[PDB]
Amino acid sequence: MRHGDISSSHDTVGIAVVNYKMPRLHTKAEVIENAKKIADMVVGMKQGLPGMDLVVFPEYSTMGIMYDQDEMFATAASIPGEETAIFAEACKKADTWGVFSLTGEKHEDHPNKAPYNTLVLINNKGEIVQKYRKIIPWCPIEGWYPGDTTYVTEGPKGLKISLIVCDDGNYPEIWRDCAMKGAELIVRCQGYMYPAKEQQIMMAKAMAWANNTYVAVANATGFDGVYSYFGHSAIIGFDGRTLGECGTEENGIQYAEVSISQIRDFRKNAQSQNHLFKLLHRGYTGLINSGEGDRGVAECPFDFYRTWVLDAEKARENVEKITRSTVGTAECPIQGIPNE
Amino acid sequence: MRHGDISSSHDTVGIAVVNYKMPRLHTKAEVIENAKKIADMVVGMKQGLPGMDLVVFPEYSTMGIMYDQDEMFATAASIPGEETAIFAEACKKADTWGVFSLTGEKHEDHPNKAPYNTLVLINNKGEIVQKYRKIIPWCPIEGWYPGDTTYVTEGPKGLKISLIVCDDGNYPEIWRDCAMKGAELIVRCQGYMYPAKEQQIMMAKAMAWANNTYVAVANATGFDGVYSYFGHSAIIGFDGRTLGECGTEENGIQYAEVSISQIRDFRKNAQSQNHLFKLLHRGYTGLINSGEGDRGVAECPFDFYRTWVLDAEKARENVEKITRSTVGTAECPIQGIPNE
Amino acid sequence: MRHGDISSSHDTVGIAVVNYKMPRLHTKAEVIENAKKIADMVVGMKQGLPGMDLVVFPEYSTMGIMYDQDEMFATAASIPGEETAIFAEACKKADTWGVFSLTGEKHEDHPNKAPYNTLVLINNKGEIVQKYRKIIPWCPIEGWYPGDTTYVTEGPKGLKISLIVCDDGNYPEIWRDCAMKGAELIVRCQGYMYPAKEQQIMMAKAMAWANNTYVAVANATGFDGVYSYFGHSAIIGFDGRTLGECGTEENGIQYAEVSISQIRDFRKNAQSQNHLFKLLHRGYTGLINSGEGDRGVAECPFDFYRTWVLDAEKARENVEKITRSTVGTAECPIQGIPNE
Amino acid sequence: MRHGDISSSHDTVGIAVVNYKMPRLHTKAEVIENAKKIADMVVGMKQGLPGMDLVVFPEYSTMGIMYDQDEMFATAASIPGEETAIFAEACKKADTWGVFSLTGEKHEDHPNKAPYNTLVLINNKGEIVQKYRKIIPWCPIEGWYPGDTTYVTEGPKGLKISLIVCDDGNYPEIWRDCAMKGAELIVRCQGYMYPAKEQQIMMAKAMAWANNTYVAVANATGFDGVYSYFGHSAIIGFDGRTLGECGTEENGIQYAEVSISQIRDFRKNAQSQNHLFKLLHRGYTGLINSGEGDRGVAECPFDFYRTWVLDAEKARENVEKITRSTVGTAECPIQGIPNE
Amino acid sequence: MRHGDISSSHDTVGIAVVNYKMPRLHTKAEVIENAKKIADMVVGMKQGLPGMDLVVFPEYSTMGIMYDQDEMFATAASIPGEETAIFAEACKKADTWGVFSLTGEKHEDHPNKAPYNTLVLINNKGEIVQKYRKIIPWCPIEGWYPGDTTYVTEGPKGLKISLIVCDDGNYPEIWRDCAMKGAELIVRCQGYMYPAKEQQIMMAKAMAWANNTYVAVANATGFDGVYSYFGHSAIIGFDGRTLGECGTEENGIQYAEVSISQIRDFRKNAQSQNHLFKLLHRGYTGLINSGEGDRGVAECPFDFYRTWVLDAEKARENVEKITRSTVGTAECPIQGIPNE
Amino acid sequence: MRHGDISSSHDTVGIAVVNYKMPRLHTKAEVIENAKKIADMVVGMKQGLPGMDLVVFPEYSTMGIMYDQDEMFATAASIPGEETAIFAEACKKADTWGVFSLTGEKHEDHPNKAPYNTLVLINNKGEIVQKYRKIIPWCPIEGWYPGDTTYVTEGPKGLKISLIVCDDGNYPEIWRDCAMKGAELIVRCQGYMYPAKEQQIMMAKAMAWANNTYVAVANATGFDGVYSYFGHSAIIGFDGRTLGECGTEENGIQYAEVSISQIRDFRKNAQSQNHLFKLLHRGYTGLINSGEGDRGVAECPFDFYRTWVLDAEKARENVEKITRSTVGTAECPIQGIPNE
């Protein structure tokens, strides 16, 4: 957990994040050409950052956002496929792990159902070792089919990694889910468009803190014909302090070393802010002093989670009362989104 | 949701938060004397802030922290009791609602079990309308008996209010639970000691954003013989932007107007960042476009919450593997906290 | 007055501001081509921001700065004209109002007098509803003919709008003049070159506060052969707090919702910081308590404004004593600017 | 215009500002005792800051705020009087100029009309050389009789000084009026209570910039039974950059050196941001190039100022349409302030 | 190197720094009484921070600044002496190391020469293990006799510690000297008075970076009759990033864990920003590639240091040409400091 | 020392710094073409900044970084040479001094030894008046031959200038060496790649303060195939306060006026923070009061500098004990850098 050098040691994973300029593409050939530009970038970056063990690119960095539905279906990727092979070759040549984005990934029922929005973690031998599908697409605008699962994978130097995508990170539940599965680094890849710049910078830091986890964010930059993306790719320590952060600049890079021993030492020995531990051992001091054993209280005291798990339809009905009953609003209608 | 004036309107709730200097007390008589100082402060503040509808004091602002166990038991409050009556009279005289702290509140089995750490919301007629007991005491140091329930109460001008305490706010689950019960303002009262100043400032803002809720924080200040408290009492908008924030100064005050219509308009009409709505209607656009109905997906996709709700002991066992198995650590032992 | 979403409601005007990359143009054909790029950008942005009701482009975003005098005269626009028709079509297609820049607009005595530096507000039906000519050109460098009038126009959802340009905003008088005419949003369009980046960021916020008015700023970006423009387009609340702000990035966008009801509620009910009201009712409490009626004092107590209005030549003579008597300085001479 | 040292030179005026802790006083004897504490503080500060030429205390630093009307009248000061003599002796002993606050100063018709809220500038020989009465009392709460005049006085080393008070500084007109009278330093003394902390910090800087003037702010601190005062006393350069700024701490001090030659050199030779010059020579380049002489345009183009000067009652009527017609609001009533 | 918890581990040294309120004392009895208050504070802090291994108090925290020469001599301490014994007992009772200030420490020729300004490092067994005398007193105001030596001492858990005082830290040479002796933590104790608040915050961070060293700063707070002290006690990582920082509040505390293994791993394996290594192996890559061996260049290329070491009188003469020849200036005279 | 205007006076040097976009070049013809682009930029900037007296471009702005060894040797420049003549013509035409980068400059033994990394200062008559070779190349990556000398040159309006390059600025010794030679402005030209953005921003400010010197930084921007450069070109006052600073934007420019009289007045009359003076007159007050003469102590008290000057090999051996013995590390090997 230290910032400023280009090296890494047996204790540290050298992580690079990329403010990748958002592509404006339309065809499979264009996507392939851009995939090879990403590959060239990985290999060049390694020449400058000899400590690099993990390189992270934004959501949409391969395809851009395929606004046209026909182009969306025509450019939807197979995984593994040609794009991933191109990335895998760069990971091998540069002896680094990498996180890349396929938007979309063909649905099982392609082309009759919406593609997934997908991340892969590729190891330094070119093997895909995690494939994550976005659980919370950025509706209403995003039409991707939602995924349903988080994963944890042993990463470079044994650092445990989970992937999440963009809108996912607004929801503290996903970060919690990953950390509770044992994640030591949560990688948030995004094409996060303005307006919500400051909110997203703050969210990543707050989630690093709340879940005692390293966080790396790669966010797109530039204007793509529709959105302007605000960058601020970052690596953040498990104590909630930014290691390094980019500005809004096209193809900015940040690089930091995250210590394997430090996070494990903290998770073992931290007390007042060992949030993962404390959530499942509430009021331990009080119970000890009250003659009630030495483990605190594990039981979930929050009705929302009990209801959501038991009766998701009831939780949905409850939230519609507080918000609205239809996915769209007649005050700001969107074609294909019902309202009223 | 606006800041800078001392007024309030039929649309806005005028909220004041107090950087109350942490008392260093030892006896019931001293606690009573300090309760009357708080009462005098409420009445004086109202003279300067004619818009004030809600005034918020820090956790521990009534008793301070009773480090001595005998003094802790001797000063534990009844609710309702003498302290609350003193506060209630000030709320009536100043025609304001108030949030006050009783640390401790007598356990049902007093003095044979640890007291609770408790907040009350008192209305402008002097009636206690919410009583909240801290669900996550700040272990290891805090020996309070943990509470088990969150509440929502109709507040001034119909603004829906939930109370939480200090360490509670590190855990996104509690903020979620309150907002999903319909809370429009979450009031976090704290005696939040250094070190974790910047982390706590960031958490409140991030939670305001994540849960589309107004947030008010009152935090103690000064040195009490053991801890120094970092202040930064604040009122924050539902869009994650600070309204007003104090520094670390003793008896600082902030004051802001929170609009009832604005939060309700947002919760109805916001789309891309309507987090409460979107969490229970995931990927609605994708499902519509895939011919699968117009509600998105409600089901909880996060195994941690499913496991915690179904089998809290399993969730506890899982987290002990990632952290440690005993509440204490032999590397930093604490008397009365078992380890090793 | 809220930030982070892409929606808007019947209560809120969705405002987008654009960090438009400064063009480097030389011919009428090039200007037309760039006008169509702006039009394409408006239509694309609306696809991503369905709440958008108003889109704002920087001063000079259509022509760039025509440094060459011959090119300046050759590219000076008619209003209405071809450029405005191109913009009007985009406003109609995207169902949004827009603010666009014509630099220059032909003088009545074209080509024998300097063109104006002009903004138009175009409604969602493609109609020009305000035309503003820069009252304070950025002399010495800017050679535009000064305008003489501010305007207020009913805008989207009835939001009252005034336009001002770049250097204008350094002078608190213009913001005052607009707000006192009833403006609820002041739109500052600029091609504000470095050096004065931080000063301009601060000015917009301070003027929002001082005049209890929403402020939107669109500023150019990039290097154009002569100047580098610092971006930081922004939308600011009437309470002086930034809603959203861009960085220095080319073609950054910000977007915020400004509430019609909130500003009107504030202007009615705010007291201590109701600056528009208080300026014309000074010391009302004192006069009441002194038996002198209940309106305070309206009379202007500032000799500078009395003198400027009555005897502008005297005010000019007075200021020349404090500064210098000639428009140029021999210590930093500029061709065509007399000194010495 | 430089910060960090305790010295001053023949070119620089050493200015100290004081975050003076707000007194809570009730009697004339208490006021006198506090005046002598201020005097002792002046003499001590000079021992530590040998460059000090000017020392500035907050509005209300002598009396505190006399909330009780009877006490207000009983403690209203004569000027010159006992309090000013006490201050004058300290200025002589410490060989410094000083700015002090008398709240109230007896009205000409004392005790039958409200006192003034007054500042004095005392020179190093103990002579009162400026007496300023607050033109914009902070209504509704403040009941002081409004003053009607700004002043400029030759200060230490010939630095030209104007005094303004607290609420005055929210109104850009007063800063303009002082600078146009030739002020080189505007001293804003305040007892500026929370909420509006960030807005006031920003205002002082923005006004320094807009009027090309040094600014010194002394603001009170602490809680006085009614308000908490936010400090942030500051000295700011004529280029809008803070020299030094205090936090919210009780009895904080800042100290900076302001160069006489620098401001005079700037006012002579600055061009693009010579705001005082440019306001009265608008569009000079354009007029030259259009064959219309070399002075630009002086005439006031802002109808608000023309109307206010000619017909203040009309300006008042106009603003009441935009705000409200009565000084009070029935939505937030205040005893003695009419509404409805 | 992590922040937020109250614990520490076998790998981390738990460091607390104290914003100690500056005493205003006059007699030996008063100094002793205050020393016991510091002792009580150490023991209380340990109850709240069970990880604490090192506690740091400001320069002057024991005596305050003895402005009166007679009182200065009467209160000058012996080391070891009564004050240090009081501190030593607290270190033993709280099982912590501590850094304390003796101002003054009796000169060898007391009372005929000025006392030293001195820090002691006391271990958890109550033994004084380092005594440092300020090498750069804060002249002209400070009249302490200058010390001449820096030290490095094995500290808690083997962390190597050097002490420096206040004004010392403005001079990069002292930080370099300590780090090159092997220091892993440089402790800067200060009574750093306003004006130079922001400069001092920045210096500590910059020196942490430049010397790849942990830095802890304890600074005084409050007003002492002459100066106001700006606090901002801090612990900073060897990568230049703040761990935790106080504000200006009286008796603020910060606490952070500094990893022994992290700094040693960095000093071994860092490359591009291994400043200690690189300074003595300049251009190693270039020399290798030029066929000139594999060590780079060690020789000092800076004439100033060569001259200062060889001919300090020449270096002094050189600097007097750039500045002034006498220690005082007639433009800002100070009694006892010659000028002219 | 003032910021915001485009003018300059007889007292001020108008300094422009350029966030020049990093070139990606391969051939001599490409370098020449880019040199002419820089020349065109100088002439254009002068049209917009009539006060400009000095223009500063980043290290590598002429060649980019020649990663290919063959291309490095093929494009190594003669000085004076074709590139410098191109720059000299622009300086003459625009009547400005300029700082330009030649990377590499041919070694005396070209092409058999590594080129130098070189800056030239060219006056307004096109004459090269300083040539500086980087003393601390950014090893391990940079293979330039190290230079050995700093210089001071009389610059525009007599302002004394020293040049340093990029990695040089991490080492406080070089800034000290320049200031002690009489430098009034230190110009740091850099191609400073991410990661170390915040550290470099802080270093420049801290060095301005520590050495009481103006500082100008020009840093590259953009991605060049290997590194992304973080911009933040800046001009900083001798009191450590930023005048103007760029963001990370490609071809950003900042411009500020630095006063000749202000720095000379400060160096003469400053006392408490006259660091250049005080370093060579330590404890003057103490020695005076102790009867030991009126000059303080000049002797160097820091063993590191004494050892480095006398026995550089010993200093190297000492530092290898604290860090590592070989220039490379087997934990992060780099081809051509020995380790193990």
UniProtKB/Swiss-Prot annotation, chains A, B, C, D, E, F:
Active-site annotation: 59 (proton acceptor), 134 (proton donor), 166 (nucleophile)
One family name in Pfam for this protein: CN_hydrolase
Thermal properties of activity per the entry: Thermostable up to at least 50 degrees Celsius.
Keywords: Hydrolase
Domain of life: Bacteria
Enzyme class of the recorded protein, top EC level: hydrolase
EC number: 3.5.1.4
SUPFAM superfamilies (UniProt xref): Carbon-nitrogen hydrolase
UniProt-recorded Gene Ontology molecular function terms: amidase activity
Domain CN hydrolase: 13-260
Intrachain disulfide bonds: none
Catalytic activity field: a monocarboxylic acid amide + H2O = a monocarboxylate + NH4(+)
Functional description taken from the UniProt entry: Catalyzes the hydrolysis of short-chain aliphatic amides to their corresponding organic acids with release of ammonia.
UniProt family annotation: Belongs to the carbon-nitrogen hydrolase superfamily. Aliphatic amidase family.
Name the UniProt record assigns to this protein: Aliphatic amidase
